[PDB]
From a paper:
In this work, we sequenced, cloned and overexpressed a spider [name] (PpAK), an enzyme crucial for rapid energy energy fluxes in invertebrates. AK has a similar function to creatine kinase (CK) from vertebrates (ATP: N-creatine phosphotransferase, EC 2.7.3.2,) providing fast energy during muscular contraction by the back-phosphorylation of ADP by phospho-arginine. In AKs and in phosphagen kinases in general, the canonical fold is comprised of two domains; a small N-terminal globular domain and a large C-terminal α-β domain. Interestingly, the active site is located between both domains and a large conformational change occurs during catalysis as a hinged rotation (Zhou, Ellington & Chapman, 2000).
Author numbering: 1 to 310, 321 to 357
Amino acid sequence: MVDQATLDKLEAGFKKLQDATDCKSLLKKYLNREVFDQCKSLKTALGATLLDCIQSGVENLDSGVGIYAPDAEAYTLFAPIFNPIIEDYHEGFKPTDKHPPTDFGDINTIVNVDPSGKYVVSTHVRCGRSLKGYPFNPCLTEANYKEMEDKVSAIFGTFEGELKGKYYPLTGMDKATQQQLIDDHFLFKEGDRFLQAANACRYWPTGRGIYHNDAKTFLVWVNEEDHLRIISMQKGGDLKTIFQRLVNAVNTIESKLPFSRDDRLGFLTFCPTNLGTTIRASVHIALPKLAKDKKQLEAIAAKFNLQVRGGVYDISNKRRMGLTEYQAVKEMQDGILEMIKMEEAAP
Ligand SMILES: NC(=[NH2+])NCCC[C@H](N)C(=O)O
Ligand code: NA
Ligand code: NA
């Protein structure tokens, strides 16, 4: 049962969201009274309540989304509020829809997106994973964090080949090590107010750490937002080598530690934006001609299901759910190939 103290905070939060007439989060949009009354008295098997989902969007009213998952069960148990937010954010992933089974596909159909070297500065493929049996960061204990780091660092120690590298615990990290990792853009810090209000940064820095291979083309963040954030990257556009490295790595990890995955949602993540494939495939790319009209540059990316962010821009696949890991990477690749064709043919 939910304790009366949590029920009281929940009721105060619900009212606070209705009184913020100018607040525009997805949480506020879909947390109406009936959805709230459906959910407020539920509790997962690991002890997570609705407050462990919505507290950050109650405390930060400028949140774009405003909800996080405190454990894997919370996605199903609290479906009445998660499902409409997931649908909205992922642009048509309905409550009755289903994400495909995992498929990394035929890696040999993946190509270098810019053999010319003229346009793509670097290419990157990011994924995320939760480890089966562990709550998510809102509900992990100090002992969980410690035990998880022990198991994860043990696995990283077995990496050989191009994956062989070093684990750096944040606990007891010295300032020279930190500066070394900042220079590599490999360091993460305590979360901002959105994560703080979500109870994601408790017992910092216990259980948090960084791994990277000697080549500095592979990086893992442990307990930064998800249990594991796994990135493969390098200069140039060799998406084939990059993606295959990521897959080798994820498969190696999985062989020792099972992941949390849902038949409807795919891979379960702390934020609902990272569900499904979890894949974020991107290039840092300069398109001088196409970009001299940023509205049309954004329009062009938008036609290939791409998102432009921060001369050199980050262009990535917008879609995470409803498509396989292969299809997601292939969509970035085909979109980038086309935009380069356009840039090369533009006057
Ligand atoms: N982990 C993330 N990037 N989540 C996306 C949303 C972040 C923040 N809670 C917001 O809703 O604005
Ligand atoms: Na989306
Ligand atoms: Na193409």
